[PDB]
Design a protein around this ligand. Structure first.
Ligand SMILES: *[C@@](C)(CO)[C@](*)(O)[C@H](Cc1ccccc1)NC(=O)[C@H](Cc1c[nH]c2ccccc12)NC(=O)[C@@H](C)NC(=O)CN1CCOCC1
Ligand SMILES: *[C@@](C)(CO)[C@](*)(O)[C@H](Cc1ccccc1)NC(=O)[C@H](Cc1c[nH]c2ccccc12)NC(=O)[C@@H](C)NC(=O)CN1CCOCC1
Ligand SMILES: [Mg+2]
Ligand SMILES: [Mg+2]
Ligand SMILES: [Mg+2]
Ligand SMILES: [Mg+2]
Lengths: 222, 195, 204, 226, 196, 233, 211, 195, 196
């Protein structure tokens, strides 16, 4: 029997700053125990200061991104070159995903950018279209490895202030872009060690009011 | 849903229907009315798969009400029951059949006679002095076979119905949360508020 | 249905400088239902500590079994069993049920009384030994624990620093697992003193 | 796993990677797949990890007793025969796929053995998920009359092919060289091409960060005197 | 697999390819499928390698013990031991074996033992997945009382075609000659037999 | 939904400093039967692109016709069909990838694995893969089926990353491809000795080599191998 | 999930948890399971997150169009029915959606239960999700029509806590809503971790748990 | 069978067990006692597959009674519970396992403490202040979590138990025909005849 | 079934057995599997008789209509029509067809169309359940540019062996000769071909 779905591995990670946002993902593409490519980009600049990544089944991921990029194009044509806000993009993507409620895009989708007040924004989607704005989200193969680390090191969960013994929490101080990139790199280095589908390369897209910037880092190739 | 009973006496038809509605392992409601008035002198109770029951009942109700307005005339219980049967017999060979069993209790104003029709989801119609759907008949029919007369009063019909519910409450594993009882006679439809 | 995830639970062990640590959650459930918040999964036979995850009946059964075997070992050998030796005993005992196994994920932790060397080990349900230098994880949130341990851990930690690291690894992994939590215990082990601490965590 | 075996001039060499997996998760990053049956008979195992260890220890135990009984040094054909008859009896349910190699009074030997009990002779062999990546290297570079140094190179190159190209294989390379008229040399972590880079940050916590409810001393000592 | 055994004037010759597959992967391209159970009694193996090896090892044990007590066994006797194992354990085996041997009294004999455990004495026999493609060729080209050189050419040409069409067959062509003179091993490489 | 009947095995390829190389054997298998021995699975499109196809042969022949018709259609009302507006490897690939993904979405796939190899207008190397699921990826080396398991490891020793491409000559790259085809003949039970090889260079254009054979094979060591363990004779 | 809603003297209370699951893995600690359809209509969510969001946001589209055509706010009865009719079109197709439609209209406060089968039930009290049984225990023993707004808010809050504790697939946080005739009113996000300990001390309950 | 509850208070253990037994669609009995006295100060209630329950219970009873006679001494509740657990853990890997869940309520005369042990058919033992098997805990544990104190009197334990049964009777679909309640304390075992 | 088509100097010859089976029962022992789609374009049928008959009838209709409009169609054109039907309806068909025809320009041509719907132009082709047994024989004995008498003997000997080993094949051997001279039907009975 023909199986229309597949698993191309990979892992992605989105973190929202105070006035910035990052969307990172490994560059490894796989089937079963084989490596297809060590550098196959997974995170894309979709225009209007929005970045996107559809992780899971690559064919469905490429199709969705392709359709959303197209949706941005037609949003300009139809509404006098108006900028598509991140909240409006998120809602649009929900409807793109639910169009195939009964033959889903087998992907976990994250987008990142800035809200209309200039603050950092990350939105997360399931394969059938449920979405939510989040401060932090890991998706894909090693999502369960990375998320707990982010609960601890980004939202300071289970962390309290010494001397009080559990009475007073660690205060939620904001993180800089340099601090976030450290947590991103350590997350993927740790995921690469313990997950066989993660490795080869790490590509990060950073979004600010100035635009979209890229950063690339090597990962272990075993 | 679970239990629906019906009995035709001298001058009326009495329908008893359970009050329970269950989702998963939890009883969501214990006061549910499993019935719809099709016309002033015709009442239909129903039981079957979740959702389908009310949908079907309300769809039948709308059709009979439409007929009543168009002709300024009430269809006989027999005519309504035949319409309902056809809709179910039509339904059983559909892509997704409606899984609903019904009892139709009506008073024919022309013949001055009460009438009870039992129809299952296949479209199997039978006119009866007393009837039930599902497992209800397994417990109750022996009592009805023994105690039923055609010249019974409405009060005697209610007492025999109480005995049937008591037997169900003793020997059924499921708690159906009692029954709502309704009477259909020459003056129309009314509910017995204490049972 | 899956015996390894009916009752839920987790265990993690770490090495430090002249010390080891082993920790577990306290939950016992019947799938979605939480039954007990006092089901400790760590046992000790002399100075050797054993943590067991998986099917609770087998956890209980294996504890009673290793208590049995270590008590006889001591009577005959006239000395307490060491971690390296106990690790082989666990492996032997699990593989003897190769085709009808105990559905468990054991973890050994301790310090050799003669060499003073810290020791940890993990197994599969059939006895394959995983002798790691850094840490061992087991349970329904093993994926979560691997991610926490692999990023938070650093070698040669002092007992009071190691406590914080292992505690945070457990706590945050458990908070991303529905079948783990409801309390936690951490054992800090040194050559001739052992401290046991109950952690305060969210009870959902 | 990726495991290989290569014959040469005056002996035989085997090698293996050091990754062990539980689905897509790495359980052990520095696993030991090279097992000792006897001093100069070593085997490498792929498949169910407990089975390769257990079956190797059992036959190794019986080989030691045999060697003592016969006052002779154990032969590779003995280990091979004992292994295959054991595995055949369990009809593949003991998932042990092994490369068996060694030197004995008869000479140098290299065999492979499958879980169902079939054995195989060769000058170069490979087993495991990365056997195809390794065999591609062996078929490209193997030749007759190899030296010891050439064979170790070929073997570790074949394992590297598995490490890089197979997701079921990774980390380090283990080697064991068995030469005639010499002690067998076990080269644990012969290669280390997968060391983790320094982390960007230290995640050492402030003491008192974790909330505690109770503390207590655990009595590990025996019952005391007086 | 492609295997065959052929009787001729001076005795009998066994022949086989050298390919062993695990699906479409060639696990071994230089396999020896011609196995010795006694000095001048050999067999060709097809089916499960584990099963056929286990059987041939047991048969070799039986004939070694027979020889110690009763002297050199016949080829018919060897085939009977194979049969007894293949027939009584037919539910748990997948073995197709050709038995071939040389006596001085009976000369060259060939017995084939297919899946069920039946025995069939023949002038020549073919078996294995690749045998299907050469039933026509072998039937047309076989003659009784051929010479050694003719018989070698017959097996070489036959297995050449089996290898050509069967993907499960390939590698080198191995042969074993059984005569009064002794036991001769032969080998033929692709560059030789492919151009036939 | 179907099943493949007559099939073609591995297609292998790699980039080098001035272009790309692609190769595939000439066999059409019918299960374990090596039925057809003269099948060309490399199909040139213009003088700048070669499409290598594995999997179902009837579906390959269908794709071969789509490409032939694509060339015809591109020339319609196009004075620059043999110049600026000629078909590019990226155009040809995206077309196929669109078709492959649409077919899988109708649950009626073309049971193939395709590698499009070519050189673009600006001299850039093009090498991309697509299969029956519509899955696409690019890499310095690409291979289908068994080639992915055995050829890629050998070809990645030559070009392990992007920076190794300018350092790799056409002689070295062809040598590596030819060696990989020999290894596949040793170890792939559905392969053949006869194969085709194509080179698309930005300077010397398209070179299409037919009727190549695997040579320099090692078999001599087989004579020494006897039995399966204890047998000496 | 665990959701509940109940009618009382001063309108209707609606309380929900905040957990999201992907098998044993807790995929979200803090999701919003209430939708503000309009200033006088709420919708709870239990089941497939995608179905709950899509169909209730589509319900909100249809409720707004009702206001524009009729120049009048839609009733809770009519709104719940539109939703149940949507479910009946995709009847058998595999949707998973359990929801309460809470609001205030001309007939006073209204509460309807709707599920993927097309079921539509009017009632004074409902609870849906994996942990509804635990919530019902607390509700049934403490519910009255004569409740104060302060006590009613606590009851719904405490009932979710009960479920969050025992049910493995419920927890994270509690979201409270109070519906009046001037509209609904959000009464905050309450972490269960902090709330549990607070309730344990003040109420004296959960004696079995050590703190 | 269906519902078995247990609660440990200050100075006693209280076990409540349903009275219903069902064969097919018919309730055969509404006064069944799902319990056995193992020793004067130890009571075991049970629920599971038909037949296995009583068999297992009586087999355990015989073993404990044999021990009592041999040693002229009553085993502690803890000791009995461990024996029962082992028998079930032994049973789960048998050819045909015994499909029985139990609660063991006992008063330890040495420690002067009541003790409640919950053991399922796999051999999963836990000591608890209150416990249940099957779906019973889904409805009742929220009430027990809220209302339970360890210093409760026997009378307060019975009132909290009534509230649990009332909740079960409201939200369970199955009619379990009420419960038989038994108290285990220092003076032994007695049955509450009005509940 | 055992079918084949062979090109030679003067044109092409089609050959077939005459056995049709329903399991082990021979439903027809004198079947005509050589079917005409045009004056000098014929086909050999294998697989489902219902499917192959339905196809050949449709093809005959297409080529009759082609001829009315565009004149005599090529053998390649006929094979394309077969292919188009077999390929587009592959999910609902079980047809293995060999197409053979004679032009004056192209002379004798042979196309085989196996299960998938692929097309393969060949010097000669074999198909059917009985073809497996003669892959070796046919490969060894086929030559290009044979005479008519040589080609008849080649087909006769080949199908003789296919019939000998395949139970699904048997009966008479039918042949159809396609040359410039015209169309000649041949038949060979068991007593003739069995003694070969
Ligand atoms: C490669 C990593 C591919 O697996 C090697 O062969 C490696 C061999 C090896 C040998 C000795 C020590 C360490 C590693 N094999 C494994 O790591 C093996 C992979 C694996 C997992 N399940 C398998 C089932 C069948 C064949 C191989 C399997 N790991 C294990 O076997 C360990 C992790 N144990 C388990 O995973 C537990 N299994 C026990 C049997 O029941 C299923 C679960
Ligand atoms: C309990 C937690 C049950 O597990 C709740 O019902 C919860 C309800 C809910 C409603 C609206 C939003 C979020 C959550 N349901 C789930 O969490 C739901 C449970 C689930 C999983 N598979 C199901 C199949 C059928 C019915 C329910 C199922 N989980 C999900 O829907 C998972 C798969 N989706 C997400 O977690 C989506 N996340 C995407 C990013 O935004 C947060 C949600
Ligand atoms: Mg690798
Ligand atoms: Mg009826
Ligand atoms: Mg919870
Ligand atoms: Mg015949």
């Amino acid at each position: 029997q023909f199986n229309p779905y597949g698993d191309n591995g990979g892992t992605i990670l989105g973190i929202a700053g105070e006035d910035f946002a990052v969307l990172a993902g490994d560059t490894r593409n796989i089937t079963d125990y084989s490596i297809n490519s060590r550098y196959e980009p997974k995170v894309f600049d979709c225009g209007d200061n929005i970045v996107m990544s559809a992780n899971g089944f690559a064919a469905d991921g490429d199709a969705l991104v392709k359709r959303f990029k197209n949706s941005v194009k037609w949003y300009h044509f139809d509404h006098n070159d108006k900028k598509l806000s991140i909240n409006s993009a998120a809602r649009n993507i929900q409807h793109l995903l639910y169009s195939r409620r009964f033959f889903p895009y087998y992907v976990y989708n994250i987008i990142a950018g800035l809200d209309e007040d200039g603050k950092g924004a990350v939105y997360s989607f399931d394969p059938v279209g449920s979405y939510q704005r989040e401060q932090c989200r890991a998706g894909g193969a090693a999502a369960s490895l990375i998320m707990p680390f982010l609960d601890n090191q980004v939202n300071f969960k289970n962390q309290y202030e010494p001397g009080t013994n559990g009475k007073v929490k660690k205060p939620l101080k904001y993180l800089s872009v340099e601090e976030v990139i450290k947590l991103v790199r350590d997350s993927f280095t740790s995921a690469t060690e313990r997950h066989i589908q993660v490795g080869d390369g790490l590509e990060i897209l950073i979004v600010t009011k100035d635009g979209v910037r890229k950063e690339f880092y090597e990962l272990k190739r075993d | 849903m679970d239990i629906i009973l019906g009995i035709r006496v001298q001058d009326s038809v009495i329908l008893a229907s359970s009050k329970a509605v269950t989702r998963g392992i939890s009883v969501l409601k214990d006061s549910d009315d499993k019935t719809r008035q099709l016309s002033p002198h015709t009442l239909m109770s129903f039981a079957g798969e979740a959702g389908d029951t009310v949908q079907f009942a309300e769809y039948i109700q709308a059709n009979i009400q439409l007929y009543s307005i168009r002709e300024d005339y009430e269809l006989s219980p027999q005519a309504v029951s035949s319409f309902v049967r056809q809709e179910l017999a039509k339904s059983i060979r559909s892509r997704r059949p409606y899984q609903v069993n019904v009892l139709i209790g009506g008073y024919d104003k022309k013949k001055n006679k009460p009438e009870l029709y039992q129809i299952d989801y296949l479209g199997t119609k039978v006119e009866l002095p007393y009837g039930a759907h599902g497992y209800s008949g397994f417990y109750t029919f022996s009592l009805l076979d023994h105690h039923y007369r055609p010249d019974m009063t409405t009060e005697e019909g209610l007492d025999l119905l109480k005995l049937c519910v008591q037997e169900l409450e003793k020997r059924m594993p499921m708690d159906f949360k009692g029954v709502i009882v309704k009477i259909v006679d020459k003056d129309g439809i009314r509910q017995v508020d204490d049972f | 249905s899956d015996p390894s995830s009916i009752n839920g639970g987790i265990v993690v062990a770490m090495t430090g400088k002249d010390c080891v640590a082993i920790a577990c959650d306290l939950r016992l459930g019947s799938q979605s239902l939480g039954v007990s918040n006092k089901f400790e999964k760590i046992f000790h036979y002399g100075h050797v500590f054993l943590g067991i995850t998986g099917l609770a009946t087998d956890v209980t059964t294996l504890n009673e079994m290793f208590r049995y075997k270590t008590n006889l070992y001591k009577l005959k050998e006239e000395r307490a069993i060491e971690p390296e030796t106990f690790t082989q005993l666990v492996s032997s005992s699990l593989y003897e049920r190769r085709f009808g196994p105990y559905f468990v994920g054991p973890v050994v932790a301790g310090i050799n009384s003669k060499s003073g060397k810290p020791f940890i080990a993990g197994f599969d349900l059939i006895g394959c030994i995983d002798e790691a230098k850094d840490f061992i994880v087991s349970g329904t949130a093993s994926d979560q624990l691997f991610g926490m341990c692999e990023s938070l851990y650093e070698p040669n930690l002092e007992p009071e620093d190691l406590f914080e690291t292992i505690s945070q690894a457990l706590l945050n992994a458990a908070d991303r697992d529905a079948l783990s939590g409801w309390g936690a215990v951490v054992y800090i082990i040194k050559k001739d003193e052992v401290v046991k601490r109950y952690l305060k965590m969210r009870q959902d | 796993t990726t495991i290989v075996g290569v014959k040469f001039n005056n002996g035989v060499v085997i090698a293996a990677d050091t990754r062990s997996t539980q689905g897509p998760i790495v359980a052990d990053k520095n696993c030991a797949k090279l097992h000792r049956i006897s001093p100069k008979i070593w085997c490498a195992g792929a498949g169910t990890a407990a089975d390769t260890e257990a079956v190797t220890q059992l036959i190794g135990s019986n080989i030691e007793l045999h060697s003592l009984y016969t006052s002779r040094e154990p032969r590779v054909v003995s280990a091979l025969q004992m292994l295959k008859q054991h595995l055949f009896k369990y009809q593949g349910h003991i998932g042990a796929y092994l490369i068996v190699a060694g030197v004995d009074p008869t000479g140098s030997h290299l065999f492979s053995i499958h879980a169902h009990g079939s054995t195989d002779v060769g000058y170069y062999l490979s087993l495991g998920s990365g056997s195809l990546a390794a065999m591609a290297v062996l078929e490209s570079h193997w030749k007759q009359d190899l030296t010891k140094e050439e064979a170790i190179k070929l073997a570790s190159d074949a394992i590297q092919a598995g490490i890089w190209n197979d997701l079921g294989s990774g980390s380090n390379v283990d080697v064991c060289v068995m030469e005639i008229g010499k002690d067998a040399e076990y080269l644990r972590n012969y290669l280390t091409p997968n060391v983790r880079e320094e982390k960007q940050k230290s995640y050492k916590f402030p003491r008192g960060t974790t909330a505690v409810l109770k503390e207590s001393i655990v009595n590990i000592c025996d019952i005391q005197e007086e | 697999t492609s295997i065959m055994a052929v009787t001729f004037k001076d005795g009998v010759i066994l022949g086989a390819d050298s390919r062993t597959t695990t699906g479409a992967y060639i696990a071994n391209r230089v396999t020896d499928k011609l196995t010795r159970v006694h000095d001048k009694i050999w067999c060709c193996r097809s089916g499960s390698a584990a099963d056929t090896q286990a059987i041939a090892d047991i048969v070799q044990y039986h004939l070694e013990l027979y020889t110690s007590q009763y002297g050199t066994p016949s080829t018919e006797t060897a085939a009977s031991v194979f049969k007894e194992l293949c027939y009584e354990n037919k539910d748990n085996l997948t073995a197709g074996i050709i038995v071939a041997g040389y006596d001085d009294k009976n000369k060259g004999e060939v017995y084939t033992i297919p899946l069920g455990g039946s025995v069939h004495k023949l002038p020549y026999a073919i078996a294995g997945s690749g045998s299907t493609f050469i039933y026509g060729y072998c039937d047309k080209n076989f003659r009784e009382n051929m010479s050694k050189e003719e018989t070698v050419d017959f097996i070489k040409h036959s297995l050449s075609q089996a290898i050509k069409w069967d993907g499960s067959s390939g590698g080198v062509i191995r042969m074993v000659v059984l005569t009064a003179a002794g036991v001769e091993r032969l080998i033929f490489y692709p560059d030789e037999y492919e151009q036939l | 939904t179907q099943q493949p009947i007559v099939t073609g095995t591995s297609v292998i390829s790699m980039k080098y400093d001035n272009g790309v190389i692609i190769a595939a054997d000439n066999l059409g298998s019918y299960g374990s039967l090596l039925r057809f021995n003269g099948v060309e699975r490399l199909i040139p499109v213009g003088d700048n692109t070669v499409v290598g196809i594995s999997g179902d042969i009837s579906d390959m022949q269908h794709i071969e016709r789509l490409l032939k018709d694509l060339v015809t259609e591109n020339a319609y009302d196009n004075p620059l069909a043999d110049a600026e507006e000629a078909l590019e490897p990226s155009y040809i690939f995206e077309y196929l990838a669109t078709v492959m993904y649409q077919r899988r979405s109708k649950m009626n796939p073309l049971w193939n694995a395709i590698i499009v190899a070519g050189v673009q207008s600006n001299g850039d190397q093009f090498l991309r893969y697509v299969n029956l699921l519509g899955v696409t990826y690019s890499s310095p080396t690409l291979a289908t089926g068994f080639g992915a398991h055995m050829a890629n490891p050998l070809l990645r020793k030559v070009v392990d990353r992007e920076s190794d491409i300018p350092k790799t000559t056409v002689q070295v790259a062809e040598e590596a491809i030819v060696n990989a085809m020999r290894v596949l003949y040793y170890r792939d039970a559905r392969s053949s000795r006869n194969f085709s090889l194509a080179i698309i260079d930005k300077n010397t254009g398209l070179t299409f080599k037919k009727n190549l054979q695997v040579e320099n094979m090692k078999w001599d060591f087989a004579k020494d191998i006897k039995g399966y363990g204890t047998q000496k004779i | 999930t665990t959701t509940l809603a109940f009618k009382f003297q001063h309108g209707v209370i609606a309380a929900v948890d905040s957990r999201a699951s992907a098998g044993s893995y807790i995929s979200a600690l803090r999701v919003n399971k209430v939708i503000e359809i309009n200033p006088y209509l709420l919708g709870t969510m239990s089941g497939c997150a995608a179905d709950c969001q899509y169909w209730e946001r589509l319900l909100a589209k249809e409720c707004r169009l009702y206001y524009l055509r009729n120049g009048e706010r839609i009733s809770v009865s009519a709104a719940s029915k539109l939703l149940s009719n949507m479910m009946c079109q995709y009847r058998g197709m595999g949707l998973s959606m359990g929801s309460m439609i809470c609001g205030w209209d001309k007939k006073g406060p209204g509460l309807y239960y709707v599920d993927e089968h097309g079921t539509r039930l009017s009632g004074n009290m409902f609870s849906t999700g994996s942990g509804n049984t635990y919530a019902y225990g607390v509700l049934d023993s403490n519910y009255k029509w004569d409740l104060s707004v302060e006590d009613a808010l606590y009851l719904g809050k405490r009932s979710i806590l009960a479920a969050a504790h025992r049910d493995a697939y419920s927890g994270g946080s509690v979201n409270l809503y109070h519906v009046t005739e001037d509209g609904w009113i959000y009464h905050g996000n309450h972490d269960v971790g902090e709330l549990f300990w607070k309730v344990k001390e003040e109420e004296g309950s959960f004696n079995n748990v050590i703190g």
